[PDB]
C-alpha cells in the first residue's frame, strides 16, 4: 500500500545518491581544470564546495589557504551575484512601496517627496554593477528593473504631473498672460507663475527613461492657453487649405507672445534658459496643431495623404526660417506607419505614370524625353523630403531610391529591350533604324542617371549605405548603370552590326556574280564596279543615320570597326578567293573595296588589322607583275615556309605567314592571270 511508495522512495534515494555523487566528482574535476595555478588540494576543493557560493565564505577560505587565484575567479563571480540578487530584493521592496503610494492622492505629494523616491530608485540601480554576461540571471533582474521603472513613471511622475499641470494651466487661464490683459506690473504674479513652471519643469525631469526626450509638463501648461484658443477656433476638420491658416495664427501668436514667455518664465539658475523657453515653447505650442493635422490625416484619402505630407514639409521648412526653431517641426506628427503608406502610394504613382508614357507604340519616339521628364517631376516632388535632416526617416530615403528611381530606370531599360513600334508589316531597314533609335534612347536615359548620381543627396545616401554595411559602392546607381552599359555595349551594338551586315549582304547579290575579274583591261578616271553602286548607297544611307544618333563615341566606333572587318572578310573570301584576277581587275578590286569601306568613315590613318592585311595580301598577289622580285615565285621558296625576304621587301607587317604562302600558291597555280 504505502509500502509501495516506500519501496519507490528507497529506489529514488539510491539514484539521487549516485547523481549527487558523480555530479560532485565532475565538479571537483572542473575546479581542477579551471585552476591553472595548481594550488588546490582535496580538502580545500571540498571546502570550496561546502561554502563557496557566498562571498563571506570565500573570504574565510582565504583567511585560511591564502590568496588563491581560483578563489578570486569565484569571489568576483560571487560578489556579482550577491548584489544582483540584492538588487532584485530592493526593487521588489520598491514595487511594493509604489503600489501603496498609488493610493495616496496626488495632492499629498511634494516636489521633495518625489525627489526622494527618485533618489532612492536611482540608488538601487547603482547597487547592481553593469556586467555583460550574455543573459545571466541578469535578464531576470533587467525585466524587473524595467517593470518598476514603468510603475514609477506612471503612478508617480505622470499622475502627479497631469494633476499639477491642470492646476497650473487654470492659473494661466485666469492670469490670461498671453494677452494684453496681463497684469505684468503685479510682479507678485510673475514670480508665482515661473515658480510654478519651474516646480513642474523639475518634476518633469524626475522621469527615469527605460533602458534599451521626457515630457515637459511645465511647457504643456504654457501652450495650453494657445491650445484652448486653437481648438475652439479651428473646430471643423483640418483642411489642406487650412494648414496654412494654422501657422498664420501661430506666427501671429508667437510674434506677439514668444518673448513675453521667454521673459516671464526664464529661471536660469534652475535650468530654464531663455534659448530653452524660446525653443521648447514653440515645440509645445506646435502640439495642438500636430494633433489637428495628425487627426485629419488618417481619417482622409490616400490622394490627400500625398498632398498633406508635402504641405507639412513645405510648411515646416517655413517655420525653420521664420523663428529659427531647431526643435521638432510638425514633421514628427507623421507616424512611422503613415510614412510607409506614403512610399507605397508614391511607388504606385511612379509605376502608374511610367505606363502612361510607354503604353503604346506611338509613345516610343519621345519616351526618353518623357521618361527623364517623369524622373524629374518625381524628384522635384521629393525635394522637400530629402531636405529633412533627422536620420530617423533615412530608411525611407533609401527606399525612395530603390523602389522608385532604380526600379523606374531599369523598368525603362526593360521597356526598350522588349518593344516594337513598327507596323505589323515592316522593312529590314525600318527595323535597323528602330534599333539605332533604341540605342539613342538608352544612352540618353543613361546620361540622366549618371547626372542624377552627382546630386549631393545621393552622394551622401551612398556614403551612408557604404559605412552602414562596410561596403564601397561608387553610387546607389552603380548596378542599373552597369545594366545600361552592357545593354549598349553588347546587346544593341551587336544587333546594329548584325542587322547592317544582313542588309549589306542582300545588296551584294550581283556584285558577287561579276565575272569580269579575269578579262577586263582598265584602259584615267576610274569608277567603282557598277554592281557595287547600290551597296554604296545603302551603306552610305545607314551610316548617315548612325552618325545622326546621339550614341556614345566608343560604340559608334566599335560598330563601324566591326563592320569594316566584316566588309573585309567579304571581299577576301567571297570575291578574291573564288575568282581569277588580272592586273587591271586586281586594282578594280581595291578600288571597289576602298570605295565601299570608306563610307564607314572611320578616323583617317587609324589602323584596322584586317583591313591592312587585305592590302598586303593584294600586294603579294601582284608579285606576278613585278620583274625585280619575280624570284619569290619559285616552288622551292614557297614550300620552304620562310618568308623574311618578301616581308622586308614588301613591308608586310600583318599578313600571317600561313596566308602569305597560299597567296603565292594562288599565283603559281595560275589563279592570277
Q: Helices and strands in order, then pairings?
A:
Elements: H1 3-33, H2 42-50, H3 55-63, H4 69-101, H5 111-127, H6 138-174, H7 188-204, H8 217-233, H9 240-265, H10 274-285, H11 287-298, H12 302-322, H13 336-356, H14 367-382, H15 384-387, H16 395-417, H17 428-452, H18 456-468, H19 478-507, H20 509-513, H21 533-547, H22 553-576, H23 583-597, H24 609-621, H25 635-640, H26 645-650, H27 657-668
What does this 3D model show about the protein?
The PDB classes it as transport protein. The entry lists the keywords Tip20p, vesicle tethering, Endoplasmic reticulum, ER-Golgi transport, Membrane, Phosphoprotein, Protein transport, Transport, transport protein. It forms a monomeric assembly. By secondary structure, the chain is mainly α. It has five domains: 1-184, Dsl1p vesicle tethering complex, Tip20p subunit, domain A (Methane Monooxygenase Hydroxylase, Chain G, domain 1); 185-301, Dsl1p vesicle tethering complex, Tip20p subunit, domain B (Methane Monooxygenase Hydroxylase, Chain G, domain 1, Up-down Bundle); 302-475, Orthogonal Bundle (Tetracycline Repressor, domain 2), CATH 1.10.357.100; 476-606, Methane Monooxygenase Hydroxylase, Chain G, domain 1; 607-673, Dsl1p vesicle tethering complex, Tip20p subunit, domain E (Arc Repressor Mutant, subunit A), CATH 1.10.10. It has 27 helices and no strands. The protein has helices at 3-33, 42-50, 55-63, 69-101, 111-127, 138-174, 188-204, 217-233, 240-265, 274-285, 287-298, 302-322, 336-356, 367-382, 384-387, 395-417, 428-452, 456-468, 478-507, 509-513, 533-547, 553-576, 583-597, 609-621, 635-640, 645-650, 657-668. The longest helix has 37 residues, at 138-174. It is elongated, with a radius of gyration of 45 Å.
Amino acid at each position: 500500500d504505502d509500502l509501495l511508495n516506500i519501496n519507490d522512495r528507497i529506489k529514488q534515494v539510491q539514484n539521487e545518491r549516485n547523481e549527487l555523487a558523480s555530479k560532485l566528482q565532475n565538479l571537483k574535476q572542473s575546479l581542477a581544470s579551471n585552476d591553472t595555478e595548481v594550488a588546490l588540494s582535496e580538502v580545500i576543493a571540498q571546502d570550496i564546495i561546502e561554502v563557496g557560493a557566498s562571498v563571506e565564505g570565500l573570504e574565510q577560505l582565504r583567511a585560511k589557504y591564502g590568496d588563491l587565484q581560483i578563489l578570486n575567479k569565484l569571489e568576483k563571480v560571487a560578489v556579482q551575484q550577491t548584489q544582483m540578487q540584492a538588487g532584485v530584493d530592493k526593487l521588489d521592496s520598491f514595487e511594493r512601496q509604489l503600489d501603496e503610494l498609488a493610493e495616496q492622492p496626488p495632492d499629498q505629494f511634494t516636489l521633495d517627496d518625489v525627489k526622494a523616491l527618485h533618489s532612492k530608485l536611482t540608488s538601487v540601480f547603482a547597487t547592481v554593477p553593469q556586467i555583460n554576461n550574455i543573459d545571466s540571471q541578469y535578464a531576470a533582474y533587467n525585466k524587473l528593473k524595467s517593470k518598476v521603472t514603468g510603475k514609477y513613471n506612471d503612478v508617480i511622475i505622470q499622475r502627479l504631473a497631469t494633476n499639477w499641470s491642470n492646476t497650473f494651466d487654470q492659473k494661466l487661464l485666469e492670469a490670461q498672460w498671453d494677452t494684453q490683459k496681463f497684469a505684468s506690473t503685479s510682479v507678485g504674479l510673475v514670480k508665482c507663475l515661473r515658480e510654478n513652471s519651474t516646480k513642474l519643469y523639475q518634476l518633469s525631469l524626475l522621469y527615469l527613461p527605460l533602458e534599451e526626450e521626457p515630457v515637459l509638463w511645465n511647457f504643456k501648461s504654457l501652450a495650453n492657453n494657445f491650445n484652448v484658443r486653437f481648438t475652439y477656433h479651428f473646430h471643423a476638420t483640418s483642411s489642406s487649405s487650412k494648414i496654412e491658416t494654422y501657422f498664420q495664427f501661430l506666427n501671429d501668436y508667437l510674434a506677439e507672445n514668444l518673448y513675453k514667455c521667454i521673459n516671464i518664465f526664464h529661471d536660469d539658475c534652475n535650468g530654464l534658459t531663455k534659448p530653452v523657453i524660446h525653443e521648447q515653447f514653440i515645440n509645445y505650442v506646435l502640439q495642438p496643431i500636430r494633433d489637428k493635422v495628425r487627426s485629419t490625416l488618417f481619417q482622409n484619402d490616400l490622394k490627400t495623404l500625398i498632398v498633406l505630407i508635402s504641405q507639412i514639409l513645405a510648411t515646416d521648412k517655413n517655420l525653420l526660417n521664420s523663428f529659427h526653431y531647431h526643435g521638432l517641426g510638425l514633421v514628427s506628427l507623421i507616424s512611422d506607419e503613415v510614412w510607409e503608406k506614403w512610399i507605397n502610394y508614391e511607388v504606385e504613382m511612379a509605376n502608374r505614370q511610367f505606363i502612361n508614357i510607354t503604353k503604346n507604340p506611338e509613345d516610343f519616339p519621345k519616351s526618353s524625353q518623357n521618361f527623364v521628364k517623369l524622373i524629374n517631376k518625381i524628384y522635384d516632388y521629393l525635394e522637400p523630403f530629402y531636405d529633412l535632416d533627422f536620420d530617423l526617416l533615412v530608411r525611407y530615403k533609401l527606399m525612395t531610391c530603390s523602389l522608385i528611381f532604380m526600379n523606374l530606370t531599369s523598368s525603362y531599360l526593360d521597356y526598350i529591350l522588349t518593344v516594337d513600334s513598327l507596323n505589323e508589316t515592316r522593312t529590314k531597314e525600318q527595323e535597323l533604324y528602330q534599333t539605332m533609335a533604341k540605342l539613342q534612347h538608352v544612352n540618353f536615359v543613361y546620361r540622366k542617371i549618371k547626372s542624377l548620381s552627382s546630386n549631393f543627396i545621393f552622394i551622401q545616401l551612398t556614403d551612408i549605405v557604404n559605412s552602414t554595411e562596410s561596403k564601397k559602392y561608387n553610387s546607389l546607381f552603380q548596378n542599373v548603370e552597369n545594366d545600361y552599359e552592357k545593354a549598349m555595349s553588347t546587346d544593341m551594338q551587336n544587333s546594329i552590326v548584325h542587322r547592317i551586315q544582313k542588309l549589306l549582304k542582300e545588296t551584294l547579290r550581283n556584285y558577287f556574280k561579276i565575272s569580269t575579274w579575269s578579262t577586263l583591261e582598265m584602259s584615267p578616271s576610274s569608277v567603282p564596279s557598277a554592281e557595287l553602286v547600290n551597296s554604296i548607297n545603302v551603306l552610305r544611307r545607314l551610316i548617315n543615320k548612325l552618325d545622326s544618333m546621339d550614341i556614345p563615341l566608343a560604340i559608334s566606333l566599335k560598330v563601324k570597326n566591326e563592320l569594316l572587318n566584316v566588309i573585309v572578310n567579304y571581299f577576301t573570301e567571297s570575291i578574291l578567293k573564288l575568282n581569277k584576277f588580272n592586273q587591271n581587275g586586281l586594282n578594280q578590286f581595291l578600288h571597289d573595296f576602298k570605295s565601299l569601306s570608306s563610307i564607314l568613315s572611320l578616323p583617317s590613318h587609324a589602323t584596322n588589322y584586317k583591313c591592312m592585311s587585305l592590302h598586303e595580301l593584294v600586294k603579294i598577289l601582284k608579285l606576278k607583275y613585278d620583274p625585280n622580285n619575280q624570284q619569290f615565285l619559285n616552288p622551292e621558296y614557297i614550300k620552304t615556309g620562310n618568308f623574311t625576304s618578301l616581308k622586308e621587301a614588301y613591308s608586310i607587317k600583318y599578313l600571317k605567314d600561313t596566308k602569305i604562302q597560299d597567296a603565292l600558291y594562288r599565283i603559281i597555280y595560275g589563279n592570277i592571270l
